[PDB]
Amino acid sequence: MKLNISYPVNGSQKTFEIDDEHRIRVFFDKRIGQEVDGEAVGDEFKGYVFKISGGNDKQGFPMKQGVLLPTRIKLLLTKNVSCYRPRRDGERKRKSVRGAIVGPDLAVLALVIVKKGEQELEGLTDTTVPKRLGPKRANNIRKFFGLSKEDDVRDFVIRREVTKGEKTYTK
Amino acid sequence: SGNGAQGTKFRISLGLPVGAIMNCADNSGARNLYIIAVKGSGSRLNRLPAASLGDMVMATVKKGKPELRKKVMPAIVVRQAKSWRRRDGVFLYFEDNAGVIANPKGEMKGSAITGPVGKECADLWPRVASNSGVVV
Amino acid sequence: MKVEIDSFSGAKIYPGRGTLFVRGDSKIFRFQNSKSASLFKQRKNPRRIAWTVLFRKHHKKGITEEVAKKRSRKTVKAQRPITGASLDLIKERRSLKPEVRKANREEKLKANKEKKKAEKAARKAE
RNA sequence: UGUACAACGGGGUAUUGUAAGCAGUAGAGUAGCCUUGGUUACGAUCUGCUGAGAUUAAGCCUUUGUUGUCUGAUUUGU
RNA sequence: GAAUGUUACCGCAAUAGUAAUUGAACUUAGUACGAGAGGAACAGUUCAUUCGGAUAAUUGGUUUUUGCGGCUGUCUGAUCAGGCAUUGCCGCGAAGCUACCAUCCGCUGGAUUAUGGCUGAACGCCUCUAAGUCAGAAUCCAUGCUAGAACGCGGUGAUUUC
RNA sequence: CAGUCAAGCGUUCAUAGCGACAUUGCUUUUUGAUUCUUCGAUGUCGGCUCUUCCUAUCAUACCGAAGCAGAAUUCGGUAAG
RNA sequence: UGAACAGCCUCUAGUUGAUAGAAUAAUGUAGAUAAGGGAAGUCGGCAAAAUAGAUCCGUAACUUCGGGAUAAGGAUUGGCU
RNA sequence: AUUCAUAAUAACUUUUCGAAUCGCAUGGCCUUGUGCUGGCGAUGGUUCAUUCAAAUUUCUGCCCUAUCAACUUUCGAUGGUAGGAUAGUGGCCUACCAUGGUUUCAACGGGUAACGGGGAAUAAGGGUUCGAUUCCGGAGAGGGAGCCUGAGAAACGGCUACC
RNA sequence: GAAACUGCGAAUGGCUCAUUAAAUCAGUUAUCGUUUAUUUGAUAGUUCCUUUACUACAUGGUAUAACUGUGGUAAUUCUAGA
């Protein structure tokens, strides 16, 4: 069973192939919004706490929160809802969606780390991923870099360098 | 169940004896199927032959398209009302009785199947599985 | 083993026991005992029937699954480096942000001088 | 004359389905009184006490509890 | 069921009966064979026909548990609680019983018939036969199961101080 | 219902399979033949249920023969489980 | 209660009289039920089973024009104010 | 032709709008402050008018049949009263009241191998037949039925449900 | 200047004549009984409401698309977590 675990701050994700059946029984009779035991999910996650954030069952089906059913059902999704993106103006197409209750059919189960334990895992927590880009709004960069009303916020912005081998661009 | 069946089928409780009328589950134009006999049935004194889910039988069209009438044609039972036990341990049964007209070889005469079809019947006859919409 | 839910009452369904029913439109129904199935065929409302879980859910009878809800008091408020700006350089910029009034005044004076030079150049060109 | 047996009671389990009674600025309303604006009488039912009440072995299990019982008559020999 | 010295336990086994039968699908095999259109079989596996023995955990059935709840006519002054209507009606319904309508199971050793043979004379050859001998049937006898001669049998404990 | 002889069918090829003209027997599940028992009384047809027995064997088990190449199909033997 | 001297319960009046007792085997008598098929059983829908009252609407062929007719086929039925 | 357009009062609004938008050009007021004033436009915006239109609607006009003489009126039919919905008038729907409305001047029912018109073929004049089709209007995206977006759709080269 | 967000268009056009006999349609009217993006012309000095602090108007708040990494599915203009 694939366990897709995400870790904030470091911002890294990794899949753990939990073959053992005794380990994945903690997710049984659970639903997005609860917590699971790091010792229960495996031996190397001692002292860890995880929060379920959905996933997908066999054949690949989005996990929609609020279904509160252990089996898949066909729902009429609409605009501004997850698991469906309007391809037109007002178009509402119904699709089969996996239930929120986690059962013995989740091929890939998605969690997010809540707190860090004593032991550290692989690159999942051993790698630090920086942000893709900084903010754009003047007030946003002001509150980011910690300036005042009159502090010349234009100068204190992102100045990342990209080089083609003969010239550098700050962009 | 011995003409062109792919593998055997686990025993199913028989609740469709000779004389039963089942609603037709195909677009061949027939409205009902009248049981006339059961292929591969038993022999016993004063015992009425009976059909189960997926068993190949012979039937006549009592009402429906005129050409289908006054003839005998093979049929495959796709829905049986009598409750039967599967090897999984649960007991399941269908709302009514229904069958599909087919040739003795196994190919479906119709083009589509309306309503749920038994998983045992679908597995036993590949044409039924390939022609059905939903399998339970 | 797989454990199911009764359609009529929400009762727990164990392997071996129970019955399964399908309607003409291919709908799955599971009944734990003969009573629930009999009421289902009698078209009795599970909501109206008292001993089903639906009636208790509506009437808040023994609703004690969660004593108190859990909510986030505040955001994560985590700090991470952004792009190539680097965490050390970001911290240095944050530390150097105060006492920048003199630098701002010098920049404003330089900009005013540049604007005056540009105006003089435009006047000369015209 | 004791890990004894029997009759009750308790618990477990099961069946059924929310008991009597009380209270309700819950009641389609009806007929009365002057604080013509709230109250007096009748009113299927519902709501809270209440997965409550009733039965539970006669061919379900147990019983540190109450209560009792444990010397009646015949027959048999190589 | 009396009589065999009483009673109780463990037993043997003469006799008597017998039981299991068949088919489909996968592989062999689109192979052997067959110019060709056609098309197997042994061994192995999964099932299925009929019959037999059990047993209710699951599914269904039976309702006098008259167990609970609801309903109609009448009666106890009204409520509660109850009587009758030959078991007043309906729904659910515990226990028992039952359903190839639910479940499991139904053994392997020898001797033989037809047949195919071996050695070998009659009949210097030949020959399955005259002597002997091999394989061999849903056959028979055995393994096993049921009842156990109430006059078939064995072992074991106590046999009454009054 | 079962044998014997053998003119032929079977492309040549009596007995792979049929076997004419003739002839020898078998059972009383058909029907006749005589009325010996019964007319001071054996309840007479058919159907349902049920037990057993026979082989003149439809299939299953084991084999032989064929103008049996396979499949199918035709006879014969042991065979009533 | 009910259209009713239909069926049921009660008032006045009358009776408590049908040999009784202990358990609830097979087979029976009367009353019953039963998952799927719905007459395939049987000489034969024999037996048994379903509707059945009232109200609303709707009623074919035929005919002697009076009938068929409650044709057939459908909807409602409680309590309280 | 108005209870018209319009104005003033007493209040009301899950408060509608009354520019937190974009590209070029660079001038003046003092004073030397990025202090104050300065066009071309674009987009957007509250209403009115015009246009694009849409929606009903006045009178007349459509093939053959009576081997179709009465039709509609339970449950909407002919009108009113009052209310709901529409963007609007209207039985378009709702509760009540009245029994009304059309018809031998061809109602109503049946078929049309009938989309209608502008027009085409053919004749002294009259007249006969055809018109799906290059122009206008109407219906449809296989039969229905429902709906979001959108000013404008029961939209199908937009979805949902049944065949 | 890819892609994407945003605003419009996709209710235009093209095809067929199934249904339809006061219905469509044609001639001819009304909206004083209605709506209208679009282009054209005009058209907001009042919006702080214990309106002395309750108040960024040198113009303030928030999420998100693309993107970077994890993938599931046999498959579709399929999608979930950071």
Swiss-Prot record, chain A:
**Record-listed Phosphothreonine modification sites:** T163
* GO-annotated cellular components: 90S preribosome; cytosol; cytosolic small ribosomal subunit; nucleolus; nucleoplasm; small-subunit processome
What is the predominant subcellular site recorded for this chain? cytoplasm
Signal peptide: which range, if any?
none
Keywords, comma-separated and alphabetical: Cytoplasm, Isopeptide bond, Nucleus, Phosphoprotein, Ribonucleoprotein, Ribosomal protein, Ribosome biogenesis, rRNA processing, Ubl conjugation
| GO molecular function term, any single one | structural constituent of ribosome
Among the record's GO biological process terms, what is one?
Answer: translation
Note the position of the cross-link Glycyl lysine isopeptide (Lys-Gly) (interchain with G-Cter in ubiquitin).
K116, K131, K149
Q: Domain of life, per the record?
A: Eukaryota
Compartment annotation: Cytoplasm; Nucleus, Nucleolus
Similarity annotation: Belongs to the eukaryotic ribosomal protein eS6 family.
Q: What other facts are recorded? A: Present with 66000 molecules/cell in log phase SD medium. There are 2 genes for eS6 in yeast.
- Describe the task this protein carries out: Component of the ribosome, a large ribonucleoprotein complex responsible for the synthesis of proteins in the cell. The small ribosomal subunit (SSU) binds messenger RNAs (mRNAs) and translates the encoded message by selecting cognate aminoacyl-transfer RNA (tRNA) molecules. The large subunit (LSU) contains the ribosomal catalytic site termed the peptidyl transferase center (PTC), which catalyzes the formation of peptide bonds, thereby polymerizing the amino acids delivered by tRNAs into a polypeptide chain.
How does this protein assemble?
Component of the small ribosomal subunit (SSU). Mature yeast ribosomes consist of a small (40S) and a large (60S) subunit. The 40S small subunit contains 1 molecule of ribosomal RNA (18S rRNA) and 33 different proteins (encoded by 57 genes). The large 60S subunit contains 3 rRNA molecules (25S, 5.8S and 5S rRNA) and 46 different proteins (encoded by 81 genes). Interacts with snoRNA U3. uS11 interacts with MPP10. Component of the ribosomal small subunit (SSU) processome composed of at least 40 protein subunits and snoRNA U3.
This chain belongs to which protein, by name? Small ribosomal subunit protein eS6A
Give the source species: Saccharomyces cerevisiae (strain ATCC 204508 / S288c)
From Swiss-Prot, chain B:
Q: PTM per UniProt? A: Methylated by RKM1 at 2 different sites, but it is unclear which are the 2 methylated residues among Lys-39, Lys-105 and/or Lys-109.
Q: Where in the cell is it found?
A: Cytoplasm
N6,N6-dimethyllysine occurs at K105, K109
Residues annotated with N-acetylserine modification: S1
- Domain of life, per the record? Eukaryota
Q: Name one Pfam family in it.
A: Ribosomal_L14
| Extra information | There are 2 genes for uL14 in yeast.
UniProt-listed HAMAP family: Ribosomal_uL14
This one is known as Large ribosomal subunit protein uL14A
This chain's source organism reads Saccharomyces cerevisiae (strain ATCC 204508 / S288c) (Baker's yeast)
Curated annotation (Swiss-Prot), chain C:
Q: Which residues carry this modification: Phosphoserine?
A: S7
Name the GO cellular-component terms: cytosol; cytosolic large ribosomal subunit
Q: Which one GO biological process term can you cite for this protein?
A: cytoplasmic translation
Q: Where in the cell is it found?
A: Cytoplasm
Mark out the compositionally biased spans (Basic and acidic residues): 89-126
Keywords (alphabetical) are:
Cytoplasm, Phosphoprotein, Ribonucleoprotein, Ribosomal protein
Additional information: Present with 247000 molecules/cell in log phase SD medium. There are 2 genes for eL24 in yeast.
What family is this? Answer: Belongs to the eukaryotic ribosomal protein eL24 family.
Protein name listed in UniProt: Large ribosomal subunit protein eL24A
Species, as recorded: Saccharomyces cerevisiae (strain ATCC 204508 / S288c) (Baker's yeast)
